[PDB]
């Protein structure tokens, strides 16, 4: 009579909830390992404001014919 255990069903549901959360952490971990080591944008990596990488040089003797694409 003093034996008052939790039922089989509630036990199985609790273990299932635990395993579900562990699988959620697994997917989050993989997804972040993938989000890192993914190529970013230049603005996120170097310069948000001057996002044009292209280097403009000096101006004291700017020769027409020195720009190129």
């Amino acid at each position: 009579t003093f034996f008052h255990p939790k039922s089989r069903e509630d036990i199985l549901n609790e273990e299932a909830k635990i395993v579900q959360a562990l699988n959620n952490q697994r997917e989050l971990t993989i997804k972040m390992h993938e989000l890192k080591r993914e190529e970013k944008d230049y603005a996120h990596s170097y310069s948000p404001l001057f996002s044009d990488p292209v280097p403009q040089g000096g101006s004291i003797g700017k020769a027409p014919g020195s720009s190129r694409e």
């Binding site: 027409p64 014919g65 720009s67 190129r68 694409e69």
Partner: protein, 171 residues
Amino acid sequence: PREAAAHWVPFEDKANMPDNVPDVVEVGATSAPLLSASYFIGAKCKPYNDDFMLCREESQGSGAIDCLKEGRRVTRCAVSVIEDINKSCLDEFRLHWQCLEQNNHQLSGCRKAEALLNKCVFTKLNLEKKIPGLRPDEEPVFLKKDPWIKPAVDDFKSVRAYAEAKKNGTL
């Protein structure tokens, strides 16, 4: 670019231009008359010079081979300017550039002859000197009445001519 360093032998090239590139006369005027005529040239060859530098910019590396027509028109505009000067305003031009050569090509030492030249070419060729980028407030330095900087020796022929021309009212 840079200058030669540590050793350098001049070397020419006795070849001729390709037959697909026509022929153009050269300006053949030296540093001093050319510097005198700079302003009159720029007042007349402005669109042509601008088109030249624009086609050099658009070409993006091939400017030496794509801009030949434009440089040719520039050279011809220049020759027309200097021919108009020598035909019409010769002695005044000679006064200016000799006054320059007896200085360090500082234009400050030649203002009298420069005045006679601007007057004559404005009356005949209708070309005036103008320094751009200035406000209406700023006073251009070639029209200042009593400038701070004056030559070591005002040129003789220039001074005699300036005085005789004020006496004659030409200025």
